[PDB]
Amino acid sequence: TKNIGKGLTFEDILLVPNYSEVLPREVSLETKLTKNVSLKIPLISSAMDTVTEHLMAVGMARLGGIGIIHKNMDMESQVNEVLKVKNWIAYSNENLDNKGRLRVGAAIGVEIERAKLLVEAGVDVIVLDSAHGHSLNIIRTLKEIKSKMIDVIVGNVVTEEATKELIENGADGIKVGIIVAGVGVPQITAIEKCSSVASKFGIPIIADGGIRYSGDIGKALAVGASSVMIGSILAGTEESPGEKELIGDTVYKYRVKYKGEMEGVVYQLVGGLRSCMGYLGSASIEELWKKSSYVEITT
Amino acid sequence: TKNIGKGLTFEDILLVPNYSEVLPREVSLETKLTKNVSLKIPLISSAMDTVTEHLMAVGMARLGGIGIIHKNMDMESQVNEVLKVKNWIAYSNENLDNKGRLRVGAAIGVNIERAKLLVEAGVDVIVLDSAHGHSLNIIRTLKEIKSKMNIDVIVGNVVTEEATKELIENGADGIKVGIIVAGVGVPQITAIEKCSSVASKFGIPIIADGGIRYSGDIGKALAVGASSVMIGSILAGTEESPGEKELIGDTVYKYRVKYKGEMEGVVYQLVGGLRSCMGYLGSASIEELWKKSSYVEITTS
Amino acid sequence: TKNIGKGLTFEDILLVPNYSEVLPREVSLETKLTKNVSLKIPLISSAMDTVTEHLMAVGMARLGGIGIIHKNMDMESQVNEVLKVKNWISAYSNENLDNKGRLRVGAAIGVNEIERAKLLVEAGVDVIVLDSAHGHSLNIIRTLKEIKSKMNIDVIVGNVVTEEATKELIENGADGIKVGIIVAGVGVPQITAIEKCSSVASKFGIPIIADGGIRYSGDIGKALAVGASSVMIGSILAGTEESPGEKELIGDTVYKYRVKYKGEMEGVVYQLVGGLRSCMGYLGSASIEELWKKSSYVEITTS
Amino acid sequence: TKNIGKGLTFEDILLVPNYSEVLPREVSLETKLTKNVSLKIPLISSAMDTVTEHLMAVGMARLGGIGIIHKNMDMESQVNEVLKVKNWIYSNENLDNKGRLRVGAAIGVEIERAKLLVEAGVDVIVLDSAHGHSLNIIRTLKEIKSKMIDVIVGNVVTEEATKELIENGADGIKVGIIVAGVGVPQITAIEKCSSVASKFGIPIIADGGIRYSGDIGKALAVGASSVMIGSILAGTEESPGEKELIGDTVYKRVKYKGEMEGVVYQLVGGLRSCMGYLGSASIEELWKKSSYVEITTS
């Protein structure tokens, strides 16, 4: 039988409320990014050219999490970007290094030299982003990094096989999230399948792609995820790459729509995670894996 | 496994007709609001500032149901709004207290000073509402009322069976059931089912709150264990609702919400739907409905 | 558990092709309306005031099937519409004729109208149809008992949906049974209905009629295939010429006095019969009999 | 018990990513059409009067494919459309063992026609029909084999039918069946048909219901050897109509689509990628290592 079974997305389920003693405020947002790296809030900016560059990795680490930079630039620009973040001259929170600064990241395309001048410039994590992680060309760029430079997050997968197979070769964290090619696995039943294995092993999960509203990210961590990757919903903000076009009745980031000051967006999303964790009586993300429960919504 | 069951809404089900002797007009719609407070029809008007103040709660009571004055005001104000109802010194299907005056209820917020004055005011039932009802703060405001005061108490919003066990065990006389930014909820039919597992065993009546678009839903609620439904947005711009009238684009608005005319037309229609459902299901009472009700699973179409 | 299963309607199903050796044109479309009465095409026009009166009851019985005069009128004038159809004296080829060789008519009654029945039978009516919104009632069983014990005749159920309902109804003497039922929140999807009602309809020679849920030619195929012997079309014969009303042009489309226009009903019946033929051909069935025997279907997830 | 389970279509399932040894730009699209005709891409153009004449069968077989000339013209008219293909006077061509491009022709219950098209030297005769598992379709298929060729039989979905048709004569099996009220959702239909016919090297052809490049991926993955594309090629320059502009957009009646190489290259790149994710070097590879999951409309 080629038919595995019913695969669920965020729109497919709602979360069941539990006995609660914790208020929205009290809740602990701290959690692990890799093993040796950790995030104060469980949100990390996406490795998309239209979203995450400079002022972004700023707002990302000073508000609690990390920010990942893309592979679509000449070396010295990803090197002169990471080094522009770590360097600085009532923003409370603030995620820092061990030599106490800021936090950043980078994308690696399957190459090894870009991973070199990155790690040397002092990069906290580097991600092996690839439209299909479970391979030979990627399974290998692992060992070709482990035995030279660092905590590595390997690119996107959706299978239980693709996660045992990956962590063995030293996968220090996993990105899950795979019309045209006709391939995919709905996001919930992915994380449900990928952390069913990424545990026992101390290896966290990053839910990449599909994040529309606050009550989405709740379900992600609830299911296994240790963090969540935020792309399109930050796409056109002020602190991202684009210029500005004023053309009547509307304003764009040059082509994409302007989504204002980024802080607000990360505030309204954190606020959602807070209200979610309240309802569910999870005091902290580790508690949300123990005390979850969800029902299926036949729309 | 995290996936428990599949959850169901009113829209997911259609009730199944059984053998029937009794006519839509000959059915009794008496139910219970709490162990000590009855109703003549199973409709309660929400504790929303767009729905119920005084003139609304009086409309409700005179028709069998009751109103629950919202808490979105001063303590002084709310004590006066319950009074105006207590002192209404025909209307044959009216709901009176053991003292011969119209019944009324009032909403209350987590953590008592408001409670006291309302129980002092003559309010009949106290509704302690919350986004999340199975919490420690809410249980704490429940036993810390039942010791200082003696009034009947309806509690919070709850969707799980664990939650309705504890609230009863702590002295709730009724419990209501109803829970995108959230990401949290169990659907109404599956919620009303689970909460009745526990409640219909202690004789404690359930109130079905929110999710009520039209007549069909009111029947479908009570059939799956609810003792009464609570109506809200359906009564939003009605003459007895709090706002003031005003004309904009050749249509009448309130305060903004689109005005719905006289309330009684709304509540007669709804009752007419319920009477009609218990006819198809051969039920001359609500406790009859609980015993002989059936439903099927609908996929859109 | 109050969950008694899933409820499937027409658009949840698709009929599965079988080994075939009959073409559309080759097929038998003959069936039973009751034990005693029978139809040449399995189509009843409704008993709504907007579709079946004398003029509509004729084009149905000419083309093979039948029509049931709506009850929304006085006693004597319904008798007149009845005796108007039993009297068509001046190709037909498919005409449904009785024992005297006149056109076939059925008529509708309700509540406990015992006197309307007496008047209709003696006027020559072939069936009486006892409608209630809910037919599994003590008031419909009291009326069935009393019509069947007295005025001979063939009586139709009313409106049932469960199997206990059709069972209880045949016990008291129902010759034909009728299946079909937001303001109330009640109902059972039409496929799931005809199946369970048909699970009890056979075992006795009692045929089942499909009332409601009928939009397209292909919902007729789906209904008879699951058990029905007859389907009752009505919604879609409302604007036709032969239904009561008044051609009355407003704006740029012709209406009725209140529904939109549909032209000649012959054109619809011929469209529906011809689509049934195409279906029966895919299922490799030369009758409804054979259809029931070899039918099969799968569930569609719409998209 | 009547109902025989939930049937699935392309939109209900997504494919599940496997262990991947292979690349996109490096897979053997190659496959089988009939027990003995091979194709360089698994796409065959349909026999609709509004899709496949000569200029199109050419476009197909030139790109690795093949095209079935329709039965909507007198015997003569059609036979000349075949002649124009078995007679061209870039690489990756699909040619028969004598160095001439490959053509199919359709027929449906019609010996006299069938012999002629064979005589004009056609590769495949296609016994197309509404309901394929009929009597008049067995007898037509039989009489044809006992008087000459290659034969495909016309749209079945039930597994029984894929058997009574192979059992006596069939070389390939085409799968695909509002007013109608009949059919089996496409994925379930291929699947049901493959399981009862993959045994013999008899290829199943996925006929119709196709939309985006993904669908081709899905359709083979489950068991089909080749997928036929119909309404996606309809209004391209190499099809039947004539070009004329009426208000903004150009038509043929149906909206214009442009060169057909572009409809195919894009469709070629979708199978490239699909197989890349499901890490199969070949099509026969894929029918051994293919998992899928269900989606709901939400």
What's the token pair of residue C157?
Answer: 């159920």
Reported resolution in A? 3.2
Q: Which residues contact D91 (CB under 8 A, 6 or more apart)?
A: none
Count CB-CB contacts under 10 A for residue B80.
Answer: 14
Q: Phi/psi at B107 (nearest 5 deg)? A: -80, 155
SS3 D204: strand
Q: Give the distance from residue B14's alpha carbon to the nearest chain C alpha carbon, in angstroms.
A: 5
Q: Is A209 annotated as a binding residue?
A: yes
Query: B–C: how many Cβ contacts below 8 A?
Result: 100
CA dist D41 → A25, B18, B126, D152 (Å): 60, 60, 74, 18
End-to-end CA distance of chain D: 30
Q: Phi/psi at B286 (nearest 5 deg)? A: -75, -40
* Closest CA in chain C for residue D178: C218
What's the token pair of residue B242?
Answer: 């709090």
Asked whether the beta carbons of D242 and D189 are under 8 A apart, the reply is no
Q: Which residues contact D55 (CB under 8 A, 6 or more apart)?
A: D238, D239
Task: Please give the single-letter amino acid code of residue B141.
Answer: T
Q: With an 8 Å Cβ cutoff, are D158 and C303 in contact?
A: no
Asked whether the beta carbons of B279 and C134 are under 8 A apart, the reply is yes
Q: Which residue has the tokens 């070199």?
A: A116
Q: With an 8 Å Cβ cutoff, are A296 and B5 in contact?
A: yes
Q: Which residues contact B76 (CB under 8 A, 6 or more apart)?
A: none
What is the phi-psi region of residue C43: left when phi exceeds 0, alpha when psi lies from -120 to 50, beta otherwise?
beta
Distance CA C46, CA B29 (A): 35
Distance CA D153, CA D166 (A): 9
Distance CA B191, CA B174 (A): 15
Distance CA D176, CA D45 (A): 15
Helix A214-223 × helix A187-198 angle, to 10°? 30
Q: With an 8 Å Cβ cutoff, are B136 and A213 in contact?
A: no
Q: Is D154 annotated as a binding residue?
A: no
* Closest CA in chain C for residue B213: C182
Nearest to D241, CA basis, from D228, D229, D262, D257 = D257
DSSP state of D188: H
SS3 D20: strand
- Burial environment of residue B280 by CB neighbours within 10 A (0 to 12, 13 to 18, 19 or more): buried
SS3 D221: helix
Q: Which residue has the tokens 């304003």?
A: A251
Q: What are the chain A neighbours of B12 within 8 Å (beta carbons)?
A: 298
Q: Which residues contact B191 (CB under 8 A, 6 or more apart)?
A: B7, B159, B177, B178, B179
Distance CA B187, CA B206 (A): 15
Distance CA D143, CA D150 (A): 13
Q: Which residues contact A1 (CB under 8 A, 6 or more apart)?
A: none
Q: What are the chain A neighbours of B179 within 8 Å (beta carbons)?
A: 17, 279
Q: With an 8 Å Cβ cutoff, are A182 and D278 in contact?
A: no
Asked whether the beta carbons of A239 and A225 are under 8 A apart, the reply is no
Q: Which of D8, D18, D217 sits opposite A182 (nearest CB)?
A: D217
Nearest to A31, CA basis, from A180, A214, A225, A199 = A225
Strand partners, C97: C103
Residue positions counted in chain C: 303
SS3 D226: strand
Q: Which residues of D make CB contacts under 8 Å with C?
A: 2-9, 11-12, 130-131, 133-135, 156-158, 160-161, 164, 177-185, 188, 296-297
Q: Which residues contact D163 (CB under 8 A, 6 or more apart)?
A: D196, D197
Count CB-CB contacts under 10 A for residue A36.
Answer: 12
Q: What are the chain A neighbours of D277 within 8 Å (beta carbons)?
A: 132, 178, 181, 183
Distance CA D196, CA D193 (A): 5
Distance CA D117, CA A73 (A): 59
Asked whether the beta carbons of B102 and B86 are under 8 A apart, the reply is yes
Strand partners, A205: A174
Q: Which residue has the tokens 């209905």?
A: C193
* Closest CA in chain D for residue C219: D181
SS3 D113: helix
Q: Which residues of C make CB contacts under 8 Å with D?
A: 8, 13-21, 195, 216-219, 221-222, 226, 275, 278-279, 281-283, 295-303
Distance CA D30, CA D275 (A): 13
Distance CA D64, CA D272 (A): 15
Touching chains D and C? (3+ Cβ pairs < 8 A): yes
* Closest CA in chain A for residue D10: A182
Q: Give the distance from residue A75's alpha carbon to the nearest chain B alpha carbon, in angstroms.
A: 40
Q: Give the distance from residue B275's alpha carbon to the nearest chain A alpha carbon, in angstroms.
A: 28
Sheet with A43-45, side-by-side order of all strands: A43-45, A227-230, A205-208, A174-176, A152-157, A125-128, A105-107, A68-69
Nearest to B283, CA basis, from B15, B96, B4 = B15
Asked whether the beta carbons of B263 and B238 are under 8 A apart, the reply is yes
Asked whether the beta carbons of C284 and C22 are under 8 A apart, the reply is yes
SS (H, E, C) chain B: CCEEEEECCHHHEEECCCCECCCHHHCCCCEECCCCCEECCCEEECCCCCCCCCHHHHHHHCCCCEEEECCCCCHHHHHHHHHHHHCCCCCCCCCECCCCCECCEEEECCCCHHHHHHHHHCCCEEEECCCCCCEHHHHHHHHHHHCCCCCEEEEEEECCHHHHHHHHHCCCCEEEECCCCCCECCCHHHHHHHHHHHHCCCCCCEEEECCCCCHHHHHHHHHCCCCEEEECHHHCCECCCCCCEEECCCCEEECCEECCECHHHHHHHHHHHHHHHHHHCCCCCHHHHHHHCCEEECCCC
Q: Is A210 annotated as a binding residue?
A: yes
Asked whether the beta carbons of C57 and C105 are under 8 A apart, the reply is yes
Distance CA C85, CA C124 (A): 10
Angle at D277 between CA D276 and CA D279, to 5 degrees: 60
Touching chains C and B? (3+ Cβ pairs < 8 A): yes
* Closest CA in chain A for residue B183: A215
Q: Which residues of D make CB contacts under 8 Å with A?
A: 8, 10, 13-21, 191, 212-218, 221-222, 270, 273-274, 276-279, 290-298
The chains in contact with chain A, meaning 3 or more Cβ pairs closer than 8 Å, are B, D
Q: What are the chain D neighbours of A180 within 8 Å (beta carbons)?
A: 212-214, 270, 273
Nearest to C199, CA basis, from C165, C249, C158 = C165
Distance CA B132, CA B179 (A): 8
Query: A–D: how many Cβ contacts below 8 A?
Result: 107
* Cα atoms in the Cβ-side hemisphere of radius 13 Å centred on D91: 0
Q: Which residues contact A65 (CB under 8 A, 6 or more apart)?
A: A33, A39, A40, A41, A42, A43, A44, A45, A95, A103, A227
Nearest to B161, CA basis, from B195, B208, B209, B121 = B195
Distance CA D216, CA B268 (A): 57
Asked whether the beta carbons of A115 and A145 are under 8 A apart, the reply is yes
Q: Give the distance from residue C280's alpha carbon to the nearest chain D alpha carbon, in angstroms.
A: 10
Count CB-CB contacts under 10 A for residue D201.
Answer: 12
Distance CA D174, CA D133 (A): 11
Nearest to C47, CA basis, from C9, C73, C79, C75 = C73
SS (H, E, C) chain C: CCEEEECCCHHHEEECCCCECCCHHHCCCCEECCCCCEECCCEEECCCCCCCCHHHHHHHHHCCCEEEECCCCCHHHHHHHHHHHCCCCCCCCCCCECCCCCECCEEEECCCCHHHHHHHHCCCCCEEEECCCCCCEHHHHHHHHHHHHCCCCEEECCCECCHHHHHHHHHHCCCEEEECCCCCCECCCHHHHHHHHHHHHCCCCCCEEEECCCCCCHHHHHHHHHCCCEEEECHHHCCECCCCCCEEEECCEEEECCCCCCECCHHHHHHHHHHHHHHHHHCCCCCHHHHHHHCCEEECCCC
Distance CA D173, CA D154 (A): 7
Distance CA A84, CA D281 (A): 45
Q: Which of C9, C132, C178, C183 to probe the B interface (max B CBs under 10 A)?
A: C183
Q: Tell me which H or E stretch contains D67.
A: strand D66-69
Distance CA B63, CA D184 (A): 55
Q: With an 8 Å Cβ cutoff, are D293 and A11 in contact?
A: no
Nearest to D14, CA basis, from D285, D298, D296 = D296
Task: Please give the single-letter amino acid code of residue C202.
Answer: S
Q: With an 8 Å Cβ cutoff, are C185 and B10 in contact?
A: yes
Structure determination method: X-ray
Q: Which of A276, A292, A294 sits opposite B182 (nearest CB)?
A: A276
Q: Which of A271, A275, A294 sits opposite B2 (nearest CB)?
A: A294
DSSP state of D77: H
Distance CA B254, CA B260 (A): 9
Q: Tell me which H or E stretch contains D269.
A: helix D261-277
Nearest to B179, CA basis, from A295, C182, A287, A214 = A295
Sign of dihedral through CA atoms A208, A211, A217, A219?
negative
SS3 D209: coil
Q: Which residue has the tokens 């572009």?
A: D262
Q: Which residues contact D285 (CB under 8 A, 6 or more apart)?
A: none
Q: Give the distance from residue C277's alpha carbon to the nearest chain D alpha carbon, in angstroms.
A: 10
Q: With an 8 Å Cβ cutoff, are B179 and A17 in contact?
A: yes
SS (H, E, C) chain A: CCEEEECCCHHHEEECCCCECCCCCCCECCEECCCCCEECCCEEECCCCCCCCCHHHHHHHCCCCCEEECCCCCHHHHHHHHHHHHCCCCCCCCCCCCCCCCCCEEECCCCCHHHHHHHHCCCCEEEECCCCCCECHHHHHHHHHHCCCCCEEEEEECCCHHHHHHHHCCCCCEEECCCCCCECCCHHHHHHHHHHHHCCCCCCEEEECCCCCHHHHHHHHHHCCCEEEECCCCCCCCCCCCCCECCCCCCECCCCECCCCHHHHHHHHHHHHHHHHHHCCCCEHHHHCCCCCEEEECC
Distance CA A218, CA A274 (A): 9
Q: With an 8 Å Cβ cutoff, are B301 and C165 in contact?
A: no
CA dist B166 → A6, A23, B126, B175 (Å): 35, 19, 18, 11
Cα dihedral A158/A164/A169/A173 (nearest 10): 50
Q: Is A177 annotated as a binding residue?
A: yes
Touching chains A and D? (3+ Cβ pairs < 8 A): yes
Asked whether the beta carbons of C40 and C65 are under 8 A apart, the reply is yes
Q: With an 8 Å Cβ cutoff, are C275 and D6 in contact?
A: no
The chains in contact with chain C, meaning 3 or more Cβ pairs closer than 8 Å, are B, D
Touching chains A and B? (3+ Cβ pairs < 8 A): yes
* Closest CA in chain A for residue D220: A182
Q: What are the chain C neighbours of B280 within 8 Å (beta carbons)?
A: 133-134, 181, 184, 186
Nearest to A141, CA basis, from A131, A153, A158 = A153
Q: Which residues contact C124 (CB under 8 A, 6 or more apart)?
A: C82, C83, C86, C102, C105
Q: With an 8 Å Cβ cutoff, are C187 and B279 in contact?
A: no
Q: Tell me which H or E stretch contains D186.
A: helix D186-194
Q: Enumerate domains of chain A plus CATH numbers.
A: 1-299 (3.20.20.70)
Nearest to C33, CA basis, from C220, C176, C193 = C176
| R_g of chain B, CA atoms, integer Å | 19
Angle at C14 between CA C11 and CA C19, to 5 degrees: 160
The chains in contact with chain B, meaning 3 or more Cβ pairs closer than 8 Å, are A, C
One DSSP character per residue, D274-293 reads: HHHHTT-SSHHHHTTS-EEE
Strand partners, B31: B39
The widest CA-to-CA distance across chain B, in whole angstroms, is: 59
SS3 D54: helix
Q: With an 8 Å Cβ cutoff, are A14 and B187 in contact?
A: yes
Instruction: Mark A248-262 as b/e (b = at least 16 C-beta within 10 Å).
Output: eeeeebeebebbeeb
Asked whether the beta carbons of B211 and B9 are under 8 A apart, the reply is yes
